[model samples]
Target chain A: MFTGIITDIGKVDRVKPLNEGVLLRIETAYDPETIELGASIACSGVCLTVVALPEKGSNARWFEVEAWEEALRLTTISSWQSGRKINLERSLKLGDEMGGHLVFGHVDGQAEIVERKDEGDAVRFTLRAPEELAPFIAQKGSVALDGTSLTVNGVNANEFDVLLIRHSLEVTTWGERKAGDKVNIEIDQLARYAARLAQYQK
Target chain B: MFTGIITDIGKVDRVKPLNEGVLLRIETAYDPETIELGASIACSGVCLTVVALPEKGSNARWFEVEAWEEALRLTTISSWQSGRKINLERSLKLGDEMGGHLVFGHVDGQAEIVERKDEGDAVRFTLRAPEELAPFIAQKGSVALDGTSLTVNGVNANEFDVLLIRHSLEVTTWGERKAGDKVNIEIDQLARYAARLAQYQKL
Candidate 1:
């Protein structure tokens, strides 16, 4: 489980095909001592398990995870390449503060940045979700794009905008998000359930 | 920080008044060694911190947390009483598997069970959400109710239903959920953003 709070911005150092899956080596500044083999880490909005660590004396800051063909097809991982920046969060630990809403690192789908605008000191990103996923969003509701929990500042048909403060820009990969860019998305859980119940009542 | 996946079922053993909130003692079968003071736990989708633990041998199975007045008012915690079963998940560890989607344990609101039916070997639960929170829900999307990650099987104006298999019923406290029960709820993040964007376009 994650808190939907980004802790680091990792760069994809390598991307390779592993049989039917894809293998990605991510470079991060997190201390190796904190990472464990088989540990689950949120790369952007996808929950991936660490499969291997770089050898000692090698890149101590790099770790590897394999995305199966299904995971690649389901999320934005299929578009990832070397040098791409990804939002990162380690799974929550006992005694850790719950700063963000529970994030299950499960990417529900992908959102595309359709427009961008400058709003004072913040950058406003206008993004759109799949039609089926639209009902799960709401004004002022929370969404995790590329694993960063953001508040919806405004909403449109299949599109919404989030203003990333200067602080958020500096701390997350959102600073690099741009129009046409695809991002992994995890919708708020409450909205999903409510919409489902409504269907049954109908 | 919780992975919306419930790992244990906890029973409320005691509830006492605090200066500003209510203190609750919960008894669970989780190993005491894995629990730490100051740990954050998801109690049926509500994020709460562990404030105390049982004495060395009095009972290694019970822990304590305080629900601030605001929490009690905003969530189902106010309705909690002795012997009441709750879904429980410990904060995720670095190596833990994210069996379910990330659940912040910060329930946006409460969902009331409006209907219940037995479907074959599974139980179907229909629930209603606040009108304002309705747009954030969709069929096939996921929601955390009382800390359990469930898939929406159907949706209507302000309601949805989830089918729980026997495995889910046996593993979590969901088996006890019934019509009229109010459960803490966390909406899926994607749906919330999509609905918000649609509103902006209308404006």
Candidate 2:
């Protein structure tokens, strides 16, 4: 489980497709000593396990995880290449507060930014969820967009908007992302259940 | 606000009808001091606030909450009576482990157990959500069933089944639950989004 709070932004060090999966070497700032073997890390909404931790060379820290058939197909991880920035969140542990709600690092699907609007200091993004996911993206509900915890400022049909303020831009890769950029989305836990309840009742 | 861990199975100490709502006094094993004046407690999946923590003359530990119309209408809270049993979970605080997934105590709706079968060391319950909640109740997904976090073992149409292992039966009120028993259901978070994504790409 993750908090959906992106603590650091990392980059893809390397990528190689195996017989049935894609091997990824991720460059990160997290101390290699802090990460455990088979650790679950949310690499921008895609939960990948730490298959191996690369030896530190000249202060660079890197880790490896491979995505097989289903994970590769469902998320944007397959589209990732060397030098791609990734939102990062370490798994929650016994003592950490849930500053953000539970995010399983399970990316439902990937989509693109439709529009970008600069209102005041915040950069607002207009994005789309798959038609089926539209109902689950309720206005005011929480969403992990590209692994960044955010709230839906508005929603019409399958399209929704979220505003990233200055501090967010500095802490995450949101500042570098713009319209036409691909992003992974994990719908709110509460919104998902509420929508389904309404559907069940309907 | 809770872990959906069902820390304690409580009993209704008393019930009162107010002018606009129902007042409940739930008796539990938790110390009165452990609960705050306005603590959030998941009483069988209904998120209720501790309006007042009663000062006890005897040793019975109880807290009070008043459910307005919405809580009454949406969940089994309306059906509660004196002596009724309740599943209880305190609000998770910093440092608390998430033994279960996130449950807001925001109950979606109420459903009933359709069947019960004892399979060796576990009791299996077949339950039914409404048609809409069915797709969100996928097998292997976690659910907050009457405030007790459980996994869906099987699903068919609007119906699903969960096996209450012996330990689960002992820790929860599930052993007393049977067919026709009404309980609140909260769908798995992952299941909800997954179902919607699948539907969106139905081509």
Candidate 3:
């Protein structure tokens, strides 16, 4: 539901677990109108609902409404300490020059970071993928790494490699990453369904 | 995109190419009065525009239109002829159950049929995917074969294989397929974009 890129990495204002989901309030550094409730927003590539909108003059403030279990099951949100920088994107508008494909913001599984480093103008990182979600990665294919829209520079059957430029690393919070880090990963739902549709057509 | 089962297969009237794209006018056996122009429809797993609507007495018709060059390059449209059965779904509604993910019917590629046969209640087929599009096929991951939603029951990275239940083969025209035939194949755009987006972040 989201195709926009992260605009700010706000500080965690509060994290409250609700019966259906958890609510994480963030004090952003941008305009409140930049986000709205019920809107599909991409947090680093994890599509999340904007459950609560910021009050007037609440510049540098935003809120994230994550499902209790979804918050823990996906992304680094559970481990996100206060004052952490989070990537974000507003919902997409139709006919907008597509920068990326449709991202449900729903993480498919967990991935283990194997390598992270600065390469030229970008940060090159490699991750060992879960065997279950491996088929979705391809060289030059679209992937969202740590919520940033990225491409697979290299890929094995079970492992994928991505590169984040210095601009992305600096603009977002990817600089804080390290080896053995577990990042949330969402596969292309379209591809996932396409595979299934083909199977049943047999 | 929808993840609905094949409720029924409408008749295949014609598969003609025009303006560098293929125009398919297929009937939705069931009347989907809810469907309107500019609505999103899933013909199998790929999304298509509702260029034309069906009249109350007109067999619940829907036009599955495809851009010629793109369809030819991304799917099996170039090999399409008359009388081919394809899966179809009305646009997703607000309260309707979401069975699968969004599928933009912008056809991206095609897989050549390797073999097919009936296996009791199911049918199985193999396809040769391009080097760039094959890795995403997993043993249990979902795949849309020729407009029907399915699971990748098995795979061999070099050769993408698919399994079709007897119902799928019977409901669609895949039962009439033969080795070397071409089948429309499109990977999830999200999967493709995720991998591609990472590349753009680098530049």
Candidate 4:
């Protein structure tokens, strides 16, 4: 689980296409020793395993994970190349201030930006989700787009609006987002768990 | 990493003496898969890693963790034997009710039961701490004894008092506690951190 908050905007060091997957190397501000092997990291809201880490004295701090064929097909993994910047968040643990709910680094699917509007210091973007994924998106509900924490301002038929303040745009990659671009999406975990429980009892 | 809530009073299945440490298996209500490999568990207030988990559906499901020499030297893990019961709590996760503060499972030191006084439904306990550790024990603050959460009733010099009701004694290994017995101690995590910070600024 993650804090659902993005801390480091990671730079893509390399993206190597291999047998049925792509070797993804991302440079970050995290120390090499701190990255636990096999731990989950939120790479743009998609949970990627830490398959490789760097040596302690290595000045170039980077970690590597592989994107499976299914993950690339389902989310925005195909949109990356070397030098691309992506939102990255380490898994959250105890003592971290409780934020929204949590980011399981679970990408439900992809969402398309329907429109983007700049209103002074704040930027508002509306996106359309799969009709199947709409029920989990509620007005004022928490969501993760491009692996960053966001809240739903309003909900329409399969469409939801997000208002990002200046602080969010400046700190994250939100400023680069434009209409027609597709990004990874993760709905509120509580809503999905509740839905699963409701279905299980039946 | 635990919630400091004792959900299962673990039954010691085996304690195999190794060259240095010991291999231990404790049976509990938890399933084998729930015990993740390498995850830490608060066993009697001492954090132990799930080094190895016995097979599942093996008639009786049990988890195994080997204590290091340092871990046994500082904890009551040396006290466990076959059929001995112990306090067990898994690491905390998101959405787990933020019970107490949190259990990091570090046994700061061992606390000796100095005296036990009887009250009808509850038992009052006085335990002596090392004079070096007394600064972190605050009156009315939370403390963990033997990996179980409790609030300090008062603090006197190197001694502190804890009031455990009938429910606590029945649910945990505390029922066997006596004046001479030694229990693991974990001072409040926040208090310890704060006191450490205060000392750091001086240098």
Give the interface-residue alpha carbon RMSD of model 2: 5.6
Q: What TM value does model 1 have?
A: 0.54
Candidate 3 lDDT, tens digit per residue, A139-185? 65566666666767787656788888776777777778889988877
Model 1 spans > 4 angstroms off: A1-202, B56-59, B196-203
Per-residue lDDT for A177 in model 2?
91
Clashing pairs in model 4?
Answer: A44-A147, A45-A147
Instruction: Give the alpha-carbon lDDT of every model.
Output: 0.82, 0.81, 0.64, 0.80
Candidate numbers sorted by lDDT from highest down: 1, 2, 4, 3
> Residues A1-202, candidate 2, lDDT per residue (tens digit)?
8877788899999999899999999998898788888999999888999998756554558889989898888888888999999989998877554545668788878867999899888899999778656867755457888888887777666788899989889889898898888898887667667557767864
Across B18-54, the per-residue lDDT of candidate 3 in tens digits comes to 7777777776665546555656555544555666666
TM-score of structure candidate 4? 0.55
Measured with C-alpha atoms, the lDDT of residue B25 in candidate 2 is 89
TM-score of chain A of each: 0.93, 0.92, 0.84, 0.90
**How many steric overlaps does candidate 2 have?**
3
In candidate 2 chain A, what residue range of length 10 has the lowest lDDT sum?
A: A93-102
lDDT of 2: 0.81
Q: A12-34, model 1: which lDDT tens digit per residue?
A: 99999888999999999899878
User: Runs in model 4 with CA error above 4 Å?
Assistant: A1-202, B200-203
Segments of candidate 3 deviating more than 4 angstroms: A54-60, A194-202, B1-203
Per-residue error for B10 in candidate 4, Å, reads: 1.0
Q: What's the lDDT for residue B202 in model 1?
A: 71
Please give the RMSD to the true structure for each candidate, in Å: 9.4, 10.5, 10.9, 17.3
lDDT of 4 by residue, B62-98 (tens): 7888898887888888888899889998776665786
